[PDB]
């Protein structure tokens, strides 16, 4: 189907404790594949998925130099923002940048993204047409006019429609044995005595990829939401994901309830009974 590549940059100032910490992570779909940490000893962009390890020294030098340069220009941007918002030099602040691209099943460009945030709040973003900017306030509007005059959007569009897409296709092909595979959820149920009058049925979905999944309960075929609890999807720590949904039922009525699991890796949805 469709795929995405995303890079997430974070700089965190720490006045009195040296230079800001910069971190970069890169993802393809729900799989992290690179990382950079300015506090780490390596000072290198590093592989975090096996299929990226085959890239040669040129790839690693270039990616390292580029994110290293970002850590350095981020320090300038932090100073600029502090001036824009008239903030003292004593406080700690954060800048975040997200960018990347989506392609369809045919590997062709679908859309591009570039957004920036200061202290967790939107600052500036490239519109979806990749030709103009939207600014969240007047400080950001200052950046917008500057980037308009300098035709910054054109540089981003060239990257997002060209370079970004070309690398994403390459990663998809090189990592196809995993990136283009689905791991269907492994499902089971547990039963827990709440009181003498009630019990909890918990329906589990484990070891699945990608993260997208839907877990629901039915009671004699009727959708149930009351007395249900659905936890947020969480990483197993091995590249796969976990989720569960539970329902409180009158003791003796367990048999009325069915758990339903929908996932990309399932040719048809699962129905689990206790």
């Amino acid at each position: 189907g469709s795929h995405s590549m995303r890079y997430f940059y974070t700089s965190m100032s720490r006045p009195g404790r040296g230079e800001p910490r910069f971190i970069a992570v890169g993802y393809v779909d729900d799989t992290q594949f690179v990382r950079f940490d300015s506090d780490a000893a390596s000072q290198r962009m590093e592989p975090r998925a096996p299929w990226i390890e085959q890239e040669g020294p040129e790839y690693w030098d270039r990616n390292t130099r580029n994110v290293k340069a970002q850590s350095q220009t981020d320090r300038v941007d932090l100073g600029t923002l502090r001036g824009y918002y008239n903030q003292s030099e004593a406080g700690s602040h954060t800048i975040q940048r997200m960018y990347g691209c989506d392609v369809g099943p045919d590997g062709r460009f679908l859309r591009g993204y570039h957004q920036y945030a200061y202290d967790g709040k939107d600052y500036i973003a490239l519109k979806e047409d990749l030709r103009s900017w939207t600014a969240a306030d007047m400080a950001a509007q200052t950046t917008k006019h500057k980037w308009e005059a300098a035709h910054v959007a054109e540089q981003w569009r060239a990257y997002l429609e060209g370079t970004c897409v070309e690398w994403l296709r390459r990663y998809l092909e090189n990592g196809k044995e995993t990136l283009q595979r689905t791991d269907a959820p492994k499902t089971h149920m547990t039963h827990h005595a709440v009181s003498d009058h009630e019990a909890t049925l918990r329906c589990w979905a484990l070891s699945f990829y990608p993260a997208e999944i839907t877990l629901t309960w039915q009671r004699d075929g009727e959708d149930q939401t009351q007395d249900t609890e659905l936890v947020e999807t969480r990483p197993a720590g091995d590249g796969t994901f976990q989720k569960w949904v539970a329902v409180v039922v009158p003791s003796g009525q367990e048999q009325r309830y069915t758990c339903h699991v929908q996932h990309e890796g399932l040719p048809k949805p699962l129905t689990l009974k206790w």
Binding site: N66, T73, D77, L81, A150
Partner: peptide, 9 residues
């Protein structure tokens, strides 16, 4: 692969 041009706020 990451972007490689220089732009400041």
């Amino acid at each position: 692969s990451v972007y490689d041009f220089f732009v400041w706020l």
